């Protein structure tokens, strides 16, 4: 029962006896580490309690495998879920600090990139909160993806520093090490078994990150792998000879696996590295899982119970090698026969798809994979032949020519010969998505429309064969992190007006706000909370962008990966149009025509994506002029927040008035940031695409700003443009010409506008229809202007967004996964 | 006041809440870490108490700088000095372990190599025990020198694994980081000051190893440097392009500084690396020292008080760069004028010499040093010119031709032009030893004869100039580690018969054993203690060498660096002679002629020293035959203990009956292992050389086995051999021929014997006089045989060795350094 007193003693204790700094003074960094270690003490108690119960009881356990987890900062959520925010705040008060200052010392854990990773993270919170026996498995990336800086020249990339001192959270398990093999050869023994000898041998060591549940003792693990080699592999002979690099070579090759996330793969070395990362994740994870299965089993070890005890979820095609690897282990190591192993495999593994287009599903060079994982490629070839025989059986050999088409689309190997075709240099590839739909008992999309697109467009034939496999699991975000903790002002309101705090768990109770949406008292509280959140942001923007902005203005935010298809370019074009129209007006007219706005951009551009970077540069330049133009004042500000991450999101989302989700219609599978915006009472402007659809439905069409073409239209409108029919709006041309004038920039921008012109060519002819949708967009923004002027209306919309968000709780998503795929049951930790 | 109960709770606490292993079970490795962390809690309390007092009081502080510290295991000495051996033993009992088993888990800290490093370590124990305000400074080497393995083929080297899990002792100071610069250029500012810009920039981070004193709270620091670079220096551009090595390049170049000790320097890269290691040590240390001086000074900062507050001891020529660097800092950074800086420097720095020969004193390429440390080379040139003017002043310019000789020998630069010689391609070098004798206020040898050799032979001219500089400080070893803890059986005896335990501190009380040396009760206790110690060794030899040996036999040990000049070859030749003579005898005769012996060799050979390795191979082969020859049985065993280190020494020395110190007379400056042997009642066979002289004196000539030629003789006996006069003894020829017969080996050994033959040539003509001394040696060993047969006599000798060892306490040595060089006074920590 930790109180302010015990926590104070705890923090002091750690500062002295588990130091990572000099004894003098109690600065912020020291205070953070000591605080974090105090928190971790509690986490470990419950982690052990959970671990023990799970071990003794031997229920079925689920394992979520992902190449990214976007964990963010742990501190406030850890104390939050533990219900010690008050005690820790008081203890820090006693030590001459405040909670918010200490929490800001913590770096975001750079273990992921985007929604894929954040989904996994939200899931871990839900899994723990709901008492579900499940773990995450990932790689412990040293330098993350990259830290973004915004210079005069725009985006620059620099390696992450999050481990420079180290993580106070993680728990290294020195006794939890597993061998990983690469390269080498396969050979048959006199016993008839396959033996994969030789190659490179490395180790994978476990680091546990405890994940505590909300108002429970259930604390699960995010177990991360770090790759290394023994000290003995250091070549003294080389080093003493002066060949210092050559000496370090083995450990360098081993460790780089865990250096950065999504390493550049234009190079052969890059591709090899990627494949190693995947294999490392799959193999280390599986070995650890199987070890745990073997333990718990005691004397009797019934392998046919494996799927009744183990579920493995593959977050995207990255953990695909789980299928071949689990086969390899069950056959070569455990001695099972093909059918037994294949049964167990399928009943264990499941797949989640996040992609709309069939291109963008992972493929590998056959030669490359076969060189690196020879034994795996054997097992893949086998699995593929079994499929070829099952196709021929089912469809028969009466129609032909179509059967050939059904093989060409469904086969796991691409440009391969076939065993015995009745029938009468293109490169050979392995299709990982196909492998996933074959080796797994379940395939799910992340939104209702998306899941339908999986069954109808991408995996049509497989859907025909095995309808029972296909599912949907609409995405979610945790209300702990994304309401309760990131937005205390609002949380207080919800607790008041729903009459309880139960909503953090029973989030459907948000719907009870509907009936009060027009109440003037609630409206005032609501407007005050939103204003409060914006203050925190104003200082943030000051210190990070250099620009002073006012509250009392619409916060219009677009925070996501910089890509042409996300159409940051559309938003900023809208901003520049509005700017031009200002300017060509008197002061009095400006105030009557446009409401005050702070337009906030955020997100990272792929370093080698020339256009993406150009766009970031454009935005910063637009801001440069607008923000210093004295005729604009505090009517319009444009800022680009550097280094968008979970922490930034936790700051901006609570303070957001409008959020932009304006990707070319279709394209997006789901999206999650929109769900968090909605939860915080943000109003969304976006296309009919991804989760926008389900959100718009649940919040109400009147409380969402829809614009632009739709999924059905796109193909036709591209077939416009080509043929040479498309006519641009005059206002769009006006923006382009205003840019070319030099208005914002010594900087060129000709190659930027270039992408929007023409009717053919790669990287040209406005593929993403910024021009086409530009009209409906700026028109829609005028409507936003109107709504914002009517604060009674605007606030009602805000309230209804929060009231209709409850189904996007990740608790709902995980209840679904738990019951309909993994088949696991809650477990109480008294 | 920690008791068994609190310590038990402490160990349990750490096992759970500061884990580095999985929760399951309480194996040895986990138990060790938990135990060590419990110990460290106490160490930190007292480390802080000491730190605080030293800070407030602002006395003079001494800093011992060394490229090696041979710290060994910390556990038993830490609890020993804390006086908690009993409580920790009981606590571990309660947890289902025993102390000795836990302690054996700890790896020796691989931070040094030999006596040089061990001297430093002993000093740190004394310094703390005696309450002297002083720290050590060193490098935190990752892989030490190398771990020795003994194979069928002899010695193999493999990198040390001591940090593979990490040290439970060290305390990282993340806020204690100092910039180190390499390369770059110097340039003068408009203010007239020198500016060293550009080059490579790296960081040096402090790791504290607490060193507790015996029966005191004084806990000082061994502060180790680890070199690194910020995360930002990681080149993402390179890495994502596939150039994974090139990306890692900056951090690789920075970190390799702290990889291994004494890296091979045949290569240019090796030499550069060495120089970086030295500079890193000097610069990081000095910066930290100066920082501490600046602090403590408060507002008033009087640089002329620097030497009254700071002493810097240079252990050998490795920390030579302290002189140039301290000048650089005081001039360029602190703005002092040449004379002020030079005054302060000299009054701060002092030098310790460990070498007999003038060759073997460090020299550097001028071009190389000037490229790496340009600003330093400037300051060296200045210091040298000042010397050239002081020489000319003092000796005048009347004699000439001799004055030219006095410049040639004393100048710091070699093959350099002179400023204005009155007077009327050899490579340019920097003489580091010369620099040390100029920049320091004190120069000391490590033994009385050695110190005289410094003044007379090596630094004759400097002695003429500055007699006042030269001193002696005869070496010592700590009685804590090397009696009290490594030998409990004996410790109990000493406490009994001296009537108190005070001797651990007041070690002169060992002399009181003299009067009881012939007492039959003491003799029995003594013989029992020695036998007891040998049991521990028998199991050790079983598990490490594979050979079963009996107690009841003379333990005849030679443990030290394998080198021709140490003459392991002599010892083993003696063993092979004795073996041959056996064999050519009946069983009954063998027992009458030779006493049972276990002959134990230990030590490491330089990897590229062809002969040294051949010797190790020889010894192992001799053992192979002898130990399996059924006609020899337990009359003779020859073992080579692998991986000789502090722990091995702590095991073998207490169990030793005879110890061999048989280097070619002269050559050795001191030696310390002999002092530890003597302390444990070992009888020494050795030449009149190094510390053998002072030991032999103090223990009594009758209780030492002297043999072989002497320092005066050697030159004459080399001038024999050359000229072609030397006649070999027939028994020596008999050994050589017995080897050539193939007796021991398929292995060749022709190139081994080769070194002993001829009268001229590098690597030939028995330079180290194994042949010449062979007669007196085997004769002397026959005397050993005789003495061993007379157990009353033998035991008396043993007792008198311990009784006459007390002056070789490192407490005596440090009292001397403290009063006569550093001028520091004890400080009480209540
Ligand atoms: O400088 C840009 C890139 O130039 C490429 O170099 C030339 C090629 O060598 C040359 O052969 C020819 O290209 C051919 C291709 O070989 C064909 O495959 C292509 O076929 C179809 C196809 O269905 C498809 O490409 C489609 O194009 C769409 C595309 O489907 C959309 O996704 C979108 O493209 C985005 C893309 O999604 C996004 O990732 C981003 O891509 C950047 C990447 O850094 C990189 O892929 C690319 O590389 C260079 C490289 O030098 C050569 O590959 O750079 C882009 C930066 O823009 O942005 C793009 C933006 O478009 O939109 C396209 C719209 O076309 O339709 C094509 C039919 O055209 O047919 C082309 C025929 O031109 O020309 C290349 C250009 O000189
Ligand atoms: O294979 C052994 C080494 O061979 C060397 O290669 C040949 C040379 O190229 C060639 O020029 C000639 O060598 C010359 C030298 O150039 C002269 O300097 C030398 O001068 C004097 C000098 O006063 C001194 O060397 C002295 O020799 C003593 C020496 O003082 C003692 O210390 C001792 O030497 C030990 C040594 O201390 C120890 O470290 C260990 O050394 C090994 C090292 O790995 C390495 O130095 C050496 O390298 C090779 C290398 O290929 C060439 O340098 O290998 C040795 C392994 O033995 O052991 C030695 C053991 O002796 O004892 C010597 C006894 O001579 O006296 C010489 C006068 O001779 O004069 C020689 C003339 O031969 O021949 C070299 C041999 O082919």
Report the candidate in A555, A529, A515 with the shortest Cα–Cα distance to residue A804.
Answer: A515
Out of B762, B764, B767, mutate this one to test ligand 2's pocket (max ligand atoms within 8 Å of CB): namely B762
Nearest-angstrom CA–CA distance, B560 and B604: 7
Closest alpha carbon within chain B to A607: B237
Residue B65: inside a domain, yes or no?
no
Backbone angles phi, psi at A98, to 5 degrees: -125, 155
Q: Which residue has the tokens 């899931």?
A: A123
Report the candidate in A62, A60, A67 with the shortest Cα–Cα distance to residue A282.
Answer: A67
Nearest to B231 among A21, A160, A174 (CB): A160
Closest alpha carbon within chain A to B143: A231
Give the gap in angstroms from C-alpha B124 to the nearest C-alpha of chain A. 21
Report in angstroms the alpha-carbon separations of A795 from A521, A525, A701, A789, B631: 11, 10, 15, 11, 104
Residue B560 among the catalytic residues: yes
Residue A313: inside a domain, yes or no?
yes
B766: DSSP letter: -
A817 and A749 within one domain: no
A300 and A238 within one domain: yes
CATH number at residue A126: 3.40.50.2000
For residue A561, what are its two tokens? Answer: 């990966």
Q: What count of residues does chain A have?
A: 830
Residue B561 among the catalytic residues: yes
Nearest to B157 among A159, A236, A273 (CB): A236
A772 and A651 within one domain: yes
Nearest-angstrom CA–CA distance, A137 and A159: 23
Query: Cα dihedral angle (B777, B778, B779, B783), rounded to 10 degrees?
Result: 100
For residue B625, what are its two tokens? Answer: 């035959």
Residue B670: inside a domain, yes or no?
yes
C-beta separation of A491 from A513 below 8 A: no
Q: Catalytic one among B676, B736, B772, B807? A: B676
A300 and A196 within one domain: yes
Task: Verify whether ligand 1 is closer than 6 Å to residue A664 (CB atom).
Answer: no
CB count in 10 Å sphere of residue B758: 12
Q: Which of A163, A174, A247 to mutate to test the interface with B (most CBs of B within 10 A)?
A: A174
Q: Which residue has the tokens 């709309």?
A: A356
Residue B193's Cβ-side half-sphere holds a number of Cα atoms within 13 Å equal to: 14
Strands (E), B395-536: 413-414, 429-431, 443-445, 470-472
Give the gap in angstroms from C-alpha B36 to the nearest C-alpha of chain A. 13
Give the torsion sign (CA, A376, A377, A380, A385).
Answer: negative
- Nearest alpha carbon, ligand 2 atom 52: B762
Protein residues with CB under 6 Å of any ligand 2 atom? B 564, 609-611, 761-763, 767
CB contact under 8 A, A232 and B48: no
Report in angstroms the alpha-carbon separations of A515 from A682, A699, A796: 19, 13, 11
Nearest-angstrom CA–CA distance, A459 and A441: 15
CB contact under 8 A, A237 and B607: yes
For residue B658, what are its two tokens? Answer: 């005879």
Catalogue the active-site residues of A. 354, 560-561, 566, 672, 676
A549 and A444 within one domain: no
Q: Which domain holds residue B779?
A: 479-710+773-804
Query: Cα dihedral angle (A609, A611, A612, A613), rounded to 10 degrees?
Result: 90
Report in angstroms the alpha-carbon separations of B279 from A647, B373, B623: 42, 9, 45
CB contact under 8 A, A242 and B264: yes
C-beta separation of A741 from A753 below 8 A: no
Q: Which residue has the tokens 């309401």?
A: A483
Domain count, chain B: 1
Report the candidate in B284, B400, B503 with the shortest Cα–Cα distance to residue B276.
Answer: B284
Task: Verify whether ligand 1 is closer than 6 Å to residue A611 (CB atom).
Answer: yes
Backbone angles phi, psi at A396, to 5 degrees: 75, -175
C-beta separation of A670 from A448 below 8 A: no
Residue B551: inside a domain, yes or no?
yes
A365 and A271 within one domain: yes
> Cβ contacts (< 8 Å) between B143 and chain A: which residues?
231, 234, 236
Task: Verify whether ligand 1 is closer than 6 Å to residue A763 (CB atom).
Answer: yes
Query: Cα dihedral angle (A297, A303, A309, A312), rounded to 10 degrees?
Result: 130
CB contact under 8 A, A20 and B241: no
Residue A472: inside a domain, yes or no?
yes
Residue A649: inside a domain, yes or no?
yes
Q: Which of B113, B219, B227, B239 to mutate to test the interface with A (most CBs of A within 10 A)?
A: B239
CB contact under 8 A, B240 and A232: no
Full DSSP string of A261-285: SS---SSHHHHHHHHHHHHHHHHHH
Residue B699: inside a domain, yes or no?
yes
Measured from the CA of A359, which atom of ligand 1 is nearest?
A: 30
CB contact under 8 A, A175 and B41: no
Q: Which of A240, A274, A605 to mutate to test the interface with B (most CBs of B within 10 A)?
A: A240
Size of interface A-B (CB pairs under 8 A): 153
Report in angstroms the alpha-carbon separations of A349 from A157, A346, A611: 37, 5, 39
Report the candidate in B654, B675, B671, B651 with the shortest Cα–Cα distance to residue B663.
Answer: B671
A816 and A804 within one domain: no
Please tell me whether residue B230 adopts helix, strand or coil conformation.
coil
A785 and A818 within one domain: no
Give the gap in angstroms from C-alpha A744 to the nearest C-alpha of chain B. 29
Angle between helices B85-94 and B28-57 (to 10 degrees): 150
For residues A92-109, b (16+ Cβ closer than 10 Å) or e, as one string? beebebebeebbebbbbb
Nearest to A242 among B237, B245, B269 (CB): B269
C-beta separation of A198 from A183 below 8 A: yes
Measured in Å, residue A764 CA sits from the centre of ligand 1 at 9
Measured from the CA of B609, which atom of ligand 2 is nearest?
A: 44
Nearest to B232 among A158, A234, A269 (CB): A158
Beta bridge partners of B472: B445
Measured in Å, residue B612 CA sits from the centre of ligand 2 at 14
Nearest-angstrom CA–CA distance, A398 and A415: 24
Report the candidate in B349, B354, B384, B356 with the shortest Cα–Cα distance to residue B369.
Answer: B384
Please tell me whether residue A188 adopts helix, strand or coil conformation.
strand
CB count in 10 Å sphere of residue A730: 8
Q: What angle do CA B215, B219, B220 make, to 5 degrees?
A: 140
Nearest-angstrom CA–CA distance, A87 and A4: 4
A574 and A458 within one domain: no
C-beta separation of A768 from A565 below 8 A: yes
Please tell me whether residue B429 adopts helix, strand or coil conformation.
strand
Full DSSP string of A613-643: HHHHHHHHHHHHHHTT-TTTGGGEEEEEESS
A684: DSSP letter: E
CB contact under 8 A, B174 and A41: no
B481: DSSP letter: I
Nearest-angstrom CA–CA distance, A540 and B675: 67
A828 and A731 within one domain: no
Measured from the CA of B608, which atom of ligand 2 is nearest?
A: 44
- Nearest alpha carbon, ligand 2 atom 67: B762
Structure determination method: X-ray
Nearest-angstrom CA–CA distance, A575 and A479: 32
A556: DSSP letter: E
Nearest-angstrom CA–CA distance, A466 and B209: 64
Task: Verify whether ligand 1 is closer than 6 Å to residue A358 (CB atom).
Answer: no
Task: Verify whether ligand 1 is closer than 6 Å to residue A767 (CB atom).
Answer: yes
Q: In what order do the strands lie in the sheet with B683-686?
A: B636-641, B597-602, B554-559, B658-661, B683-686, B705-706
Left, alpha or beta for A154 (phi > 0: left; psi -120 to 50: alpha)?
A: left
Give the gap in angstroms from C-alpha A602 to the nearest C-alpha of chain B. 21
Q: Where does residue B371 rank: exposed (0-12), middle (13-18), buried (19+ CB within 10 A)? A: middle
Query: Cα dihedral angle (A187, A189, A191, A192), rounded to 10 degrees?
Result: 30
A468 and A557 within one domain: no
A569 and A452 within one domain: no
**Which pairs with CB-CB distance under 8 Å and at least 24 residues apart come from A423-429?**
A427/A365, A427/A366, A428/A365, A428/A366, A428/A367, A429/A363, A429/A364, A429/A365, A429/A366
Nearest-angstrom CA–CA distance, B338 and B653: 51
Give the gap in angstroms from C-alpha A49 to the nearest C-alpha of chain B. 11
Report the candidate in A732, A717, A719, A826 with the shortest Cα–Cα distance to residue A778.
Answer: A732
For residue A483, what are its two tokens? Answer: 């309401």
Nearest-angstrom CA–CA distance, B160 and B162: 6
Nearest to A236 among B48, B146, B230 (CB): B146
Give the gap in angstroms from C-alpha B142 to the nearest C-alpha of chain A. 9
C-beta separation of A623 from A547 below 8 A: yes
Nearest to B236 among A157, A242, A273 (CB): A157
Report the candidate in A214, A215, A23, A223 with the shortest Cα–Cα distance to residue A134.
Answer: A223
Residue B677: inside a domain, yes or no?
yes
């Amino acid at each position: 029962a930790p109180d302010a007193a015990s926590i104070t003693s705890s923090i002091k204790y750690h500062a002295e006896f588990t130091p990572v700094f000099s004894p003098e003074r109690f600065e912020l960094p020291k205070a953070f580490f000591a605080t974090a270690q105090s928190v971790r003490d509690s986490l470990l108690i419950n982690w052990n309690a959970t671990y023990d119960i799970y071990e003794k009881l031997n229920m079925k356990q689920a394992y979520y495998l992902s190449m990214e987890f976007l964990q963010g900062r742990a501190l406030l959520n850890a104390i939050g879920n533990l219900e010690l925010t008050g005690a820790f705040a008081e203890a820090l008060k006693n030590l001459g600090h405040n909670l918010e200052n200490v929490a800001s010392q913590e770096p975001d854990a750079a273990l992921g990139n985007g929604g894929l990773g954040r989904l996994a993270s939200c899931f871990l919170d839900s899994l723990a909160t709901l008492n579900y026996p499940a773990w995450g498995y990932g790689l412990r990336y040293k330098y993350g993806l990259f830290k973004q800086r915004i210079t005069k020249d725009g985006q620059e990339e620099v390696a992450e520093d999050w481990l420079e001192i180290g993580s106070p959270w993680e728990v290294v398990r020195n006794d939890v090490s597993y061998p990983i093999k690469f390269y080498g050869k396969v050979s048959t023994g006199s016993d008839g078994k396959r033996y994969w000898i030789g190659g490179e041998d490395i180790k994978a060591v476990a680091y546990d990150v405890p994940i505590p549940g909300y108002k429970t003792r259930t604390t699960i693990s995010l177990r991360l792998w770090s790759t290394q080699v023994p000290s003995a592999d250091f070549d003294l002979s080389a080093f003493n000879a002066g060949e210092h690099t050559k000496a370090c070579e083995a450990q360098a090759n081993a460790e780089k696996i865990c250096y950065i996330l999504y390493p550049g793969d234009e190079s052969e070395e890059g591709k090899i590295l990627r494949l190693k990362q995947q294999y490392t994740l799959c193999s280390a994870s599986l070995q650890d899982i199987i070890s745990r299965f073997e333990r718990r089993s005691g004397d009797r070890i019934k392998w046919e119970e494996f799927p009744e005890k183990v579920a493995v979820q593959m977050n995207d095609t990255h953990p695909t090698l789980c299928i071949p690897e689990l086969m390899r282990i069950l056959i070569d190591l455990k001695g099972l026969n093909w059918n037994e192993a294949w049964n167990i495999t399928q009943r264990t593994v499941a797949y989640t798809n996040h992609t709309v287009l069939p291109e963008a599903l992972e493929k590998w060079s056959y030669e490359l994979m076969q060189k690196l994982l020879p034994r795996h490629v054997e097992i893949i070839e086998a699995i593929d032949e079994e499929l070829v025989h099952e196709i021929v059986l089912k469809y028969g050999s009466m129609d032909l020519n179509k059967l050939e088409e059904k093989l060409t689309t469904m086969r796991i190997l691409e440009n391969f010969d076939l065993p015995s075709s009745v029938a009468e240099i293109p490169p050979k590839k392995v299709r990982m998505a196909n492998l996933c739909v074959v080796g797994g008992h379940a395939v799910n999309g992340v939104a209702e429309i998306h899941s339908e697109i999986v069954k109808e467009e991408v995996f049509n034939d497989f859907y025909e064969l095995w309808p029972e496999k296909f599912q949907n699991k609409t995405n979610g975000v945790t209300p702990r992190r994304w309401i309760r903790f990131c937005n205390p002002p609002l949380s207080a309101i919800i607790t008041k007006w729903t009459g309880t705090e139960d909503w953090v768990l029973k989030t459907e109770k948000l719907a009870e706000l509907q009936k009060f949406a027009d109440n003037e008292d609630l409206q005032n509280e609501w407007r005050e909370a939103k204003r409060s959140n914006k203050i925190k942001v104003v200082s943030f923007l000051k210190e990070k962008t250099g620009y002073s902005v006012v509250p009392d203005a619409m916060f219009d935010i677009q925070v996501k990966r910089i890509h042409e298809y996300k159409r940051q370019l559309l938003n900023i074009f809208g901003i520049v149009y509005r700017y031009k129209k200002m300017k060509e007006m008197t002061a009095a007219e400006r105030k009557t025509n446009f409401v005050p706005r702070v337009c906030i951009f955020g997100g990272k551009a792929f370093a080698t994506y020339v256009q993406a970077k150009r766009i970031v540069k454009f935005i910063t330049d637009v801001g440069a002029t607008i923000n210093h133009d004295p005729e604009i004042g505090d009517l319009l500000k444009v800022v680009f927040v550097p280094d968008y991450n979970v922490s930034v999101a936790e700051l901006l989302i609570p303070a957001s008035d409008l959020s932009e989700h304006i990707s070319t219609a279709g394209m997006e599978a789901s999206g999650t940031s929109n769900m968090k915006f909605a939860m915080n009472g943000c109003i969304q402007i976006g296309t009919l695409d991804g989760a926008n659809v389900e959100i718009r439905e649940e919040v109400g069409e009147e409380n969402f700003f829809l614009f632009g073409a739709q999924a059905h239209e796109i193909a036709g409108l591209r077939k416009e443009r080509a043929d040479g029919k498309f006519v641009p709006d005059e206002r769009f041309e006006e923006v382009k010409e205003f840019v070319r004038s030099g208005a914002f920039g010594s900087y060129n921008y000709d190659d930027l506008i270039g992408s929007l012109e023409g009717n053919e060519g790669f990287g040209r002819a406005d593929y993403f229809l910024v021009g086409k949708d530009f009209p409906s967009y700026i028109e829609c923004q005028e409507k936003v202007d109107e709504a914002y002027r009517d604060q009674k209306r605007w606030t009602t919309m805000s309230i209804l967004n929060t009231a209709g968000s409850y189904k996007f709780s990740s608790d709902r998503t995980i209840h679904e996964y738990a019951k309909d795929i993994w088949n696991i049951e809650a477990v109480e930790i008294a």
